[PDB]
Amino acid sequence: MVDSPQLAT
């Protein structure tokens, strides 16, 4: 359940 700013990582 992550937020989209954290997707790339």
């Epitope: 937020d3 989209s4 700013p5 997707l7 790339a8």
Partner: antibody, heavy 121, light 113 residues
Framework: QVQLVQSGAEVKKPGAPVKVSCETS????????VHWVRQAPGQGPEWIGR????????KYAQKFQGRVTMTRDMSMNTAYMELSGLRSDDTAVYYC??????????????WGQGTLVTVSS | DVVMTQSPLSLPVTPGEPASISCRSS???????????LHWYLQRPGQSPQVLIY???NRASGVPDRFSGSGSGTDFTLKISRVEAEDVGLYYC?????????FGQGTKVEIKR
């Protein structure tokens, strides 16, 4: 163009549920979170929750946990939000909102036109 | 939740004069990737929020050049260089660094006469 098209205005009695649909075009549906926001009259906007179309995973705000169900139909590029137990304070314009980030890049949001839901007997 | 504080609440502007709207976040919206997750939108009656400025400073397509946005990670400014009748309405800042998405209090821009 990126487009999000919502279903029509709803009038519902207290306690009834509402199911709003949000059909999308102009981008790959699977690649962006779909968020739901409302704004009641005499209130600031309010984030309801989101769905991740690839997994179907959902995240809801505390206040709508247990009363909202978000889903999507990949084949139709459409997201849905069902809000149950409607009260007068749920009278609001409801928006679906394409996210900003696809995994690789981050951009602007795109908003649907809004769906007015009026709670009244 | 991230708390957004917006000022002023009411902004009457004489035609042709500029307007500035401030927004501050309770924590930095500058992500370590370099993106600033702060956006500005205009709300007019009976229609969707219109994105003005996204990711801190990018102007959306079709938005007049008289709109611009800047800021640090915590303090942001929407600038309108001249204010027309077309610009009258309710302006909000919003953060999307984290969910829930949160919104400033809103500024009511009107024409001063």
């Amino acid at each position: 163009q990126v487009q999000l098209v919502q279903s029509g205005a709803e009038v519902k009695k207290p306690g009834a549920p509402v199911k709003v649909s949000c059909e999308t075009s102009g981008y790959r549906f699977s690649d962006y979170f779909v968020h739901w926001v409302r704004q009641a009259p005499g209130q600031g906007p309010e984030w309801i929750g989101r769905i991740r179309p690839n997994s179907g995973g959902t995240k809801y705000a505390q206040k709508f946990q247990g009363r909202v169900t978000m889903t999507r139909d990949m084949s139709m590029n459409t997201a849905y939000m069902e809000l149950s137990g409607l009260r007068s304070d749920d009278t609001a314009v409801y928006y679906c909102v394409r996210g900003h980030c696809d995994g690789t890049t981050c951009s602007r949001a795109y908003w649907g036109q809004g769906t007015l839901v009026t709670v009244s007997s | 939740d991230v708390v957004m504080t917006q000022s002023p609440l009411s902004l009457p502007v004489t035609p042709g004069e500029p307007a500035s709207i401030s927004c501050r976040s309770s924590q930095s919206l500058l992500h370590r990737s370099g993106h600033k997750y702060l956006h500005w939108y205009l709300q007019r009656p009976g229609q969707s929020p219109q994105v003005l400025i996204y990711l801190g400073s990018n102007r959306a397509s079709g938005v007049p050049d008289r709109f611009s946005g800047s800021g640090s990670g915590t303090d942001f400014t929407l600038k309108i260089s001249r204010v027309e009748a077309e610009d009258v309405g309710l302006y909000y800042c919003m953060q999307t660094l984290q969910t829930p998405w949160t919104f400033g209090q809103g500024t009511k821009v009107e024409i001063k006469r």
